[PDB]
Amino acid sequence: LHEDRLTLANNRFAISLLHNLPTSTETNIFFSPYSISVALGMAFAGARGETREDLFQGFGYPRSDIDDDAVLEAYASQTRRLKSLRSNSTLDAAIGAAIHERISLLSSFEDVLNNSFGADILKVDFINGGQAAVDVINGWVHRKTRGKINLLFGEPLETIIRLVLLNAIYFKGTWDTVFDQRLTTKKPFMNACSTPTEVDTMRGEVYVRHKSFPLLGVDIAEIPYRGMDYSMTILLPTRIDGAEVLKRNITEHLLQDLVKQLVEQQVTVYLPKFKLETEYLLKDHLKKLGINRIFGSGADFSGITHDANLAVSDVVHKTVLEVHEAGTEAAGATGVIIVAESLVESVEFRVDHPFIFFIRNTQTKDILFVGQVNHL
Ligand code: NI
């Protein structure tokens, strides 16, 4: 029951992280608060005492009415729910703890990583097997994401590292209404550096949930995937330069109030065929949110090992997305609806300047992906 609780904690975490991640006119943001949260659950499973209480507080489980004795079981229920509701859309996740092979592991940690997180444990030799370790990890992410994410590490890791938390995830899905490839054309997209660039721009008279919010300087359109259980929610600033103010203004509560008011409507969508590929070493950003002890000397990890001084070296996150006429995949759909011109009115939603977006499960309300596009 109260499945909303971990979802709220994760979605609040999503917005905190979006507020704090590095931004520039030249840099795009793209991350899974869902996969990063599962990764912080692995840390929670292993930490005890003040190391665990510090993570508990810093992530904010108690602010969403989750007692610490209920965290692992809330992950377990969210885990079973996402991969047991049958769906046209799929998530391929690489979630694991890479631990020095010569640390003895408590069986309970193994059991919790399995049932709570569907997480793997990669025992590797971080001291002597430097290149073999990254070869193993990189092979693991490659197979877990079915060739979408193929490297977590281009170089051996520092020989000091004993525990590193990995989370890569790929979303696959098809538009409920596929765009007609014959209508895709080169169109200007105004980057955040205020130079226009020419990009493949999809065009469709497409049923979406839409509302204009001129007072908040945002137009919003929710573009559903097939099955209606997933969507891409695009927040397009009224001002060409409005993205940083919009991102600062957005909160988990406000986003929920805005999405509720969207009305089903046929709109002319202009959507660049954009591509994102991002990696984060998240330790410093997590420190800034009050998560510190899990990364420190004298971190209590008597949940993982009764016989070594473990600290988490880092939380390594990597993800990737392409937009196509069919959805996530190039030529992933072969049927199409050729729409007659409307003769009464058609709203335009033209994504031709920096914008923010969320891929959500519309039933559970989980935010799977947060995006900011400053630059194509
Ligand atoms: Ni409200």
Numbering used by the authors: 1 to 376
What does the study report here?
To inhibit the target protease, serpins undergo a fundamental conformational change that leads to inactivation of both the protease and the serpin itself. The amino acids in the RCL, particularly the residues at the P1 and P1′ positions, determine the protease selectivity of serpins by mimicking the substrate of the target protease. However, Iripin-4 was shown to inhibit only granzyme B protease, as no other protease tested was confirmed to be inhibited.
The structure of native Iripin-4 was solved at 2.3 Å resolution and the crystal belonged to space group P3121 (No. 152), with unit-cell parameters a = 77.78, b = 77.78, c = 109.49 Å, α = 90.0, β = 90.0, γ = 120.0°. The crystal contained one molecule in the asymmetric unit with 51.33% solvent content and a Matthews coefficient of 2.53 Å3 Da−1.
